[PDB]
Amino acid sequence: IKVRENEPFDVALRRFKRSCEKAGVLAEVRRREFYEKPTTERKRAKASAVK
Amino acid sequence: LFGEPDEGIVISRFGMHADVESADGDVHRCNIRRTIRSLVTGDRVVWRPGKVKGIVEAVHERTSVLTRPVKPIAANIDQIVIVSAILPELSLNIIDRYLVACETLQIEPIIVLNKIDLLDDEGMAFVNEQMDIYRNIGYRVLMVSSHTQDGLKPLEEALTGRISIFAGQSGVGKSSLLNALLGLQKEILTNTAARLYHFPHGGDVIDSPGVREFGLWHLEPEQITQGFVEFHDYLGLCKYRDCKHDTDPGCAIREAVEEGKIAETRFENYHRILESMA
Amino acid sequence: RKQVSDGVAHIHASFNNTIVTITDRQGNALGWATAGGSGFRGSRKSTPFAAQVAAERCADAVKEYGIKNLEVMVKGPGPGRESTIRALNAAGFRITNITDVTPIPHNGCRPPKKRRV
Amino acid sequence: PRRRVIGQRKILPDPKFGSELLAKFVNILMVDGKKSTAESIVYSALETLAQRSGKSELEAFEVALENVRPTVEVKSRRVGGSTYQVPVEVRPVRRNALAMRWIVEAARKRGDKSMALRLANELSDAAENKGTAVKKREDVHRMAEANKAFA
RNA sequence: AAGCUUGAGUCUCGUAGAGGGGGGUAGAAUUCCAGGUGUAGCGGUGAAAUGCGUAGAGAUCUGGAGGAAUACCGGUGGCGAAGGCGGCCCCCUGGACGAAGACUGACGCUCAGGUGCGAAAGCGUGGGGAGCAAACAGGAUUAGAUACCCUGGUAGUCCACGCCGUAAACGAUGUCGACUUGGAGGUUGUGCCCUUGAGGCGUGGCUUCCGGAGCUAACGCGUUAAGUCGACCGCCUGGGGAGUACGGCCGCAAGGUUAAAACUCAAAUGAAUUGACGGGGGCCCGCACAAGCGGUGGAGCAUGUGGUUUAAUUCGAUGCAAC
């Protein structure tokens, strides 16, 4: 969030806490999320992560 | 199967068979033997009846002057009619692609502008100017309407004694002209064995709609070049090896373009064609 | 509008671009420059560059407000929260602290759904 | 050298200094494959440098080479085809090697008699940190510490 | 034929939960909607472009709405018949344990018809609209584009209900129940030890996997069955021809629902090996990169070839290799 940037300003030193913030939820709202793809899911919903 | 050898010209590709119009003129739907394979519509064939069904067991497809992938369709096509209208989008490279090919093949283009009538005073003019680039480049333009099938006599007369063909894009009223020419519609279209027809003023014409909505065929680099002879002259212009017709210091061809000594389109087309084979 | 020489670098990064407004800490807007306003209107604005310049072009023209202390308040996710923050702190400032800002959406509206090729 | 990475080989030095610095360097010019006569025209320069350094021929070089040599660089090997751009410390075998080469590469085929001069004229300039070779120290370090965004 | 209760059932009492109706509502937002500063953009993309802003927009700041819409709830948690269920009240409510007797006292199981309910589109048919997307379209490349690519939108979404009865409405596991691996795991009740936190520690009921035998073709499954049983209910009948015509039917309709033939083939499949390719990936090496150095090639020039000539310019020469 903050790294007391007194200097840094290209990097932010942040990639944690996305679950209501940044790219996590914010990319999926006014862009389409389908229903003939998470219809795979029913069966497929836990496998593609770390990857 | 065997029968009695007789000559014929293959009037039509009968799908499964080929239909042969005999030397007499008699059309015989003929089989085509496992033994022969160099057959196309237009071939003069030895076909035989049975002892209609015929059988074909000799052919005569004369030298290349057009292909698709890269396989001759016929021969004695002394002119290629590159017929266009704008459907379903179009480009200068597309006519030129055909031109480059006409030029390569050493089959004469007669560039036919369809829908001339469709094209307004400004539009017709613009298109004529474009048609002129090619024309200036050497490929005569005949203003026709696809629909109205105008300039039909100048075309016909160009057809006399020779065989011609219909090239372009998604039923760009090529199909329409063909109908006029024939004087019988045998095609419309809008948005290698096929069938052949014979002209009265002399000469012949070959058609297929399938060709007409377009994709395009395999080719080699030199041919594209052949498509543009002005480049040869530019090749000589810088060095005893001019870079490669394309930019690099001392690329005359490139320079000639920079100058506009060559039209840009030729170079551009040279590229669309070049890329596709690759 | 206003100054205190402490500002905020609102970086409004944007998909094919990145627009940047430096704002007083207080508010206003003080400059703005985009990334697809760092001309670009292609893959070009879809460059970080687009941003670099975006921010830069904003970040200079806010120091009218004396701004030289910025929190950066990163907004937008365009190719410009590197380049743009570049050109926001470093654009006549000492960055005083960074942050990224967001709410709990619950929306209304339907966005698009059109494509399928 | 993906398995086990490397510097230079069969080098020959000075019977009067024994300096490797001078050795890898005197050598560089070879692709004449014989510093049984290479070395000579550089000394006239390093002599004029010797004076210009206020030192000897050996240490005429030294000064100019320490200007020339890079202290950092950026390095490539292309990891993944990746555009390495991160700042790195120029390895000694390079420091030296590249540097020595850089001085030498700055007095080339020219326009008048005697390299003696040509070299002389390169040499003090590299002594003064405004040689070509030293400017490669002072250009490689400029690219360093200002790009690190890409991997 | 009468009994038992024991099943069931019932009635006695936990406990968790996104089950529901119907609605309370919350706080955000999507969006709506507006300037200022601010400033040329925004915008977009393959690559762009239409679009848009420049009108100050976007940006940003400043203001609110509109109508719409609600993470982490996210736990082998939990709830649901499923079809399916997580934004905060209330209700109305559905469904559900552990722990209690008991009683009723077989109230048991399962179901063709039949039937409820049955994802969505759709639709009827109106809602809804703050907004989106078939259809349908600009730009827009693109071989062709009419594709990519971009600048939009009714149904329907965005609303109410009716109107399908079909959704790979799928472990393609029917029901119910019982019977069949150790192990190491879950939840949720609850027993117990100092309750050793409620704990620590039994046991249920329930969840995970592995889990054997077995089974299976095999994959695997393997008690989560894909292992033993039963009833019950429903299934398969070589492949196509066919949720569809005929036909008949439901439905406003979409259309369902229902529901063909000839024809047609000597065939249709599981799982498995051993494979090799992958607009795969994951992993290394090598003047291959890489770090240099130089080379070739260029001029002049050769040699061979090409090419041409030549009568021949003699046959064997071809990534790399004419050489």
Q: Quick one: which H or E segment has residue C24?
A: strand C19-24
Asked if residue D137 lies in contact with residue D71, where contact means CB atoms within 8 angstroms, the answer is: yes
Tell me the residue type at B130.
Q
Give me the phi and psi of C67, to 5 degrees please.
-55, 130
Rounded Cα–Cα distance for residues B86 and D147 (Å): 50
Of A3, A10, A31, the CB nearest to C82: A10
SS3 content of chain A, % helix, strand, coil (to 5): 10, 0, 90
Q: Between C97, C102, C114, which is nearest A5 by CB?
A: C97
Decide: B203 and B164 in contact? Cβ < 8 Å. Answer: yes
Q: How was this structure determined?
A: cryo-EM
Q: State the distance between the two ends of chain C, measured CA to CA, in whole angstroms.
A: 48
Q: What are the residues whose beta carbons fall under 8 Å from the beta carbon of B259, sequence distance 6 or more?
A: none
- Whether omega for the bond prior to residue B249 falls within 30 degrees of 0, making it cis, is no
Cα separation, B98 vs B108, in Å, equals 11
Chain C positions in Cβ-Cβ contact with residue A19 (cut-off 8 Å): none
Resolution rounded to one decimal, in angstroms:
9.8
- Do D and B touch, 3+ Cβ pairs within 8 Å? The answer is no
Taking the CA of residue D147 and the C1' sugar atom of nucleotide E41, their distance in angstroms comes to: 28
Question: What's the CA gap between B66 and B42, in Å, rounded?
Answer: 13
Which residue in A3, A22, A31 is closest to C111 by CB distance? A31
Distance in angstroms (rounded) separating the CA atoms of residues C32 and C24: 12
B46 strand-pairing partners:
B7, B58
* Contact (CB, 8 A) for C49 and C35: yes
Residues 6+ apart with CB under 8 A from D130: none
Cα B244 to Cα B196: distance, rounded to the nearest angstrom:
41
Chains that touch C (3 or more CB pairs under 8 A): A
Return d(Cα B149, Cα B111) in angstroms, integer. Answer: 14
Contact, B165 vs B177, CB < 8 A? no
Buried/exposed B232-257: b ≥16 CB within 10 Å, e otherwise: eebbebbeeebbebeeeeebbbbbbb
Q: What is the largest CA-CA distance in chain A?
A: 49
Chain A nearest-CA residue for C109: A30
- Name the minimum distance, in Å, from the CA of A18 to any CA of chain C: 11
Rounded CA separation B73/B22 (Å):
19
Residues B79 and B66: beta-carbon distance below 8 Å = no
- Three-state secondary structure call for residue B29: strand
Closest to D14 (Cα-Cα) out of D25, D5, D30: D25
Kindly state the tokens that stand for B109: 């283009």
Separation between Cα atoms, residue B76 and residue B71, nearest integer Å? 15
Q: CA-CA distance, B145 to B158, in Å (whole number)?
A: 17
Check if the beta carbon of residue B72 is closer than 8 Å to that of residue B192. Answer: yes
Structure tokens of B209?
């709609």
In three-state secondary structure terms, D15 is coil
Which tokens in the block code for residue B83? 């017929």
Residues 6+ apart with CB under 8 A from C37: C17, C19, C45, C50, C54, C57
Interchain CB distance below 8 Å, C98 and A27: no
Q: Which two tokens stand for residue B66?
A: 């057009």
- Tell me, what DSSP letter sits at residue D69? S
Residue of C nearest to A8 (CA): C95
Tell me which chains share at least 3 CB pairs under 8 Å with chain B: none
**Angle in degrees, CA D5, D6, D9, rounded to 5:** 160
CA distance B31 to D29: 79
Q: Which residue in the block uniquely carries the two structure tokens 């050109």?
A: C87
Q: CA distances (Å), A40 to each of A31, A47, A50, C114, D13, in order? A: 20, 12, 19, 20, 72
Count other C-beta atoms under 10 Å from residue D92's C-beta. 10
Name the nearest CA neighbour of C77 among D146, A7, A21: A21
Tally of CB atoms within 10 A around D112 = 7
Helices (H), chain B: 92-105, 121-136, 152-159, 174-182, 209-212, 221-226, 230-237, 252-259, 264-277
Strand partners of residue B195: B207
Beta-carbon separation of A20 and C104 below 8 A? yes
The DSSP line for B73-116 is --S-B-EEEEEE---SS--HHHHHHHHHHHHHHT-EEEEEE--T
**Exposure on the CB side of residue B84, measured as CA atoms within 13 A:** 27
Tokens of B218: 């395999």
State the Cα torsion D46-D49-D51-D56 to the nearest 10°.
Answer: -50
- Count CA atoms closer than 13 A to D54's CA, side-chain side: 1
DSSP character string of C30-77: -EEEESSSSS--STTTTSHHHHHHHHHHHHSSSGGGT--EEEEEEE--
Contacts of D144 (CB under 8 A, 6+ apart): D72, D73, D74, D87, D88
Please list, in sequence order, all residues whose beta carbon lies within 8 angstroms of the beta carbon of residue D7, skipping any fewer than 6 positions away: D93, D94, D97
d(Cα C112, Cα C106) in Å, to the nearest integer?
17
Beta bridge partners of C21: C10, C32
- For A8-44, b/e burial (b = at least 16 CB within 10 A) is ebbebeeeeeeeebbeeeeeeeeeeeeeeeeeeeeee
Using CA atoms, how far residue B196 sits from B165, C22, D75, in Å, is: 10, 73, 67
Q: No. of H helices and E strands in chain C?
A: 2, 5
Q: Does C117 touch chain A (CB under 8 A)?
A: no
Spatial separation of the C-alpha atoms in residues D67 and D135, rounded to whole Å: 8
- Which residue reads 């490139």 in tokens? B254
Contacts of A22 in chain C (CB under 8 A): 77, 100, 102
- Show the 3-state SS of D78-130: CCCCCCCCCCECCCHHHHHHHHHHHHHCCCCCCCCCCHHHHHHHHHHHHHCCC
For B15 and E221, how far is CA from C1' in angstroms? 54
3-class SS of residue D51: helix
Let me know the angle formed at the C-alpha of B5 by B1 and B11, rounded to the nearest 5 degrees.
90
Q: What stretch of H or E contains B10?
A: strand B6-12
Any CB–CB contact under 8 A between C100 and chain A? yes
CA distance A34 to chain C (A): 8
A17 CB near a chain C CB, below 8 Å?
Answer: no
Any residues with CB less than 8 A from the CB of B10 and at least 6 apart, and which?
B18, B19, B20, B21, B39, B40, B41, B42, B43, B44, B45, B56, B59, B193, B196
Q: Helix D40-53 to helix D58-68 angle, to the nearest 10 degrees?
A: 80
Q: Residues with Cβ < 8 Å from A34, sequence gap 6 or more?
A: none
The nearest CA of chain A is from the CA of C1 a distance in Å of 25
| Å between A50 CA and nearest CA of chain C | 23
- Any CB–CB contact under 8 A between A28 and chain C? no
**Chain C positions in Cβ-Cβ contact with residue A4 (cut-off 8 Å):** 97
Parallel/antiparallel/unpaired status of strands B204-207 and B163-167 = parallel
Within 8 A by CB and 6+ apart from D9, the residues are none
CA D22, CA D45: separation in Å to the nearest integer? 13
Residue numbers in A near C89 (CB within 8 A): 5, 8-9
Residue of A nearest to C82 (CA): A10
Does C95 touch chain A if contact means CB atoms closer than 8 Å?
yes
Neighbours of D, requiring at least 3 CB pairs below 8 Å, are none
| Residue in C with minimal Cα distance to A37 | C116
- How many CB atoms neighbour CB D13 within 10 A? 18
**Nucleotide closest in space to A30 (CA vs C1'):** E30
Q: Determine whether the interchain pair A9/C72 forms a contact, defined as Cβ–Cβ distance below 8 Å.
A: yes
